[PDB]
Write a protein that binds this ligand. Structure first.
Ligand code: NA
Ligand code: NA
Ligand code: NA
Ligand code: NA
Lengths: 162, 161, 162, 161
């Protein structure tokens, strides 16, 4: 059996979501949370990770609301060893390497603040994340003018040196 | 071999990071761009010495930290050494970004303590032989002091629910 | 590179300061100190002079306090071959010629008991004294009455002959 | 040539300085002003002989030292000679001030020793031909006496840290 379903990630506007595949849930949920604290001062987040054996969604973080939401999204996804992070006061570009560098992390499915979906397949054994829909799909290739625009915007955002 | 002890000049609260790299004209700009990705709002100056033309290159996003980074770098003089002075971010938030850079060999040290760079000089040029990162420890912590620091670490913000 | 900074001379009220440019620091700090002793009996002072090669501020004198202060001021000025003198029980007019006539002295930047500043320029090589602010600046020309006043005061101070 | 030996009259502890100058009416006053700049609190009398009116000019800031300086100067008589009697200052503190004066040619001697001025006299006037500055030495110091004077010089106040 292979039934596929689409899960809409529930998160408030401005909150960044990161979905990944890990190992050793009881240790990692806490250890990865500690690691996230070292990435950006003031980062606020919730992290939840699924443990297969007891079929439990573990969670922690340093923000009640994001913790509740991370756990809710994680248990819905259900897939074993999948972890969900919901954060604010930090961007994926400031934390992805910290996550990829964690010894119990296998991979990261995706990360952003766009409307986000997790595609899950369920078999007679359990569930598996087969992909993520990170926002709407692109359907046109940028023009030279649009190239200039994005580059000016990147500098305006703060990625500029003297 | 002549040995000099250079006091790093930096404002109170400013973090300094000294390292050894390569390809100065490219790296001074590229590492600066990388630092911008480490922590939003980070303010810094970075300078790096180029041997051939004997020039201290520099950039960043803060006039004063750039001038100070360049001053410290040229006083150190050693080729391919880079000096970073930053604020609005801590070493623990950026060291991996620096170690991850393809033109970086190593990082001598990083902190906000009174800092010194020990430099050796030969007939060719100079070499960083070590760094004095603050005062030296002279007492091993007691069990009570262990509890003290662990409570402080949590109070600083390193705590999870 | 040329960064300019202003250094405020730290000294007790009533203490006279003399800043100069010399040569052969290890010899001169001691020899000039000996010379000062011949200028006015009872003179108490501290003298410090910067030696470039070892980047050390040398000092001596015959007063612990003035010696510590002279060295503190000299090391912060930093400029090689610059010497700083802090004295009491003697006035500049009693010792300037002794200093100017020392064989290892190039010049004297200034001397007085007014609030005093040393303007220093720093390059990639080292530091240089580019000037001294000897007290507040004059902004008005004396009147004939003030002229009579200062002349009476000079006599009252003791510059009067029978 | 007649030769006279003049004993300088001065109280114990007073220092005498005899010199040869020029332009007496200006110099007696100007050199006195200069002496005041040498050491704060200096007390003295200065007299100088003017040839054409055959007058001994004098000034200073001490009535008795002035009277004595003038008496000694007129007894010496020689034109353009000046005599200084001072206290609250030593020759080592003022000799350069005197030598630096534009109207001073030379300084014959200076001390607090028993002092004599040897004067020669012609049909025109008088001339200082020398000074007897205290007793004459008759023994060369021993190595031990060297140590003795050097310790005394430091004790007097000529010592640095
Ligand atoms: Na897949
Ligand atoms: Na080393
Ligand atoms: Na100047
Ligand atoms: Na003679």
């Amino acid at each position: 059996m292979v039934r596929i379903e689409v899960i809409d990630i529930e998160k408030p506007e401005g909150v960044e979501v990161i979905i990944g595949q890990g190992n050793f849930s009881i240790f990692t949920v806490d250890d990865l949370a500690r690691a996230l604290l070292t990435a950006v001062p003031g980062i606020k987040f919730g992290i939840a990770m699924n443990e297969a054996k007891p079929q439990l969604t573990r969670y922690t973080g340093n923000d009640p609301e994001l913790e509740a939401l991370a756990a809710k999204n994680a248990v819905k996804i259900g897939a074993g060893h999948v972890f969900v992070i919901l954060m604010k006061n930090a961007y994926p570009i400031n934390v992805l390497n910290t996550i990829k560098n964690h010894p119990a992390v296998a991979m990261i499915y995706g990360a952003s603040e766009n409307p986000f979906q997790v595609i899950v397949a369920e078999t007679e054994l359990g569930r598996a994340v087969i992909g993520v829909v990170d926002g709407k799909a692109a359907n046109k290739i940028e023009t030279d003018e649009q190239k200039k625009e994005r580059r000016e915007l990147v500098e305006k955002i703060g990625y500029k040196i003297d």
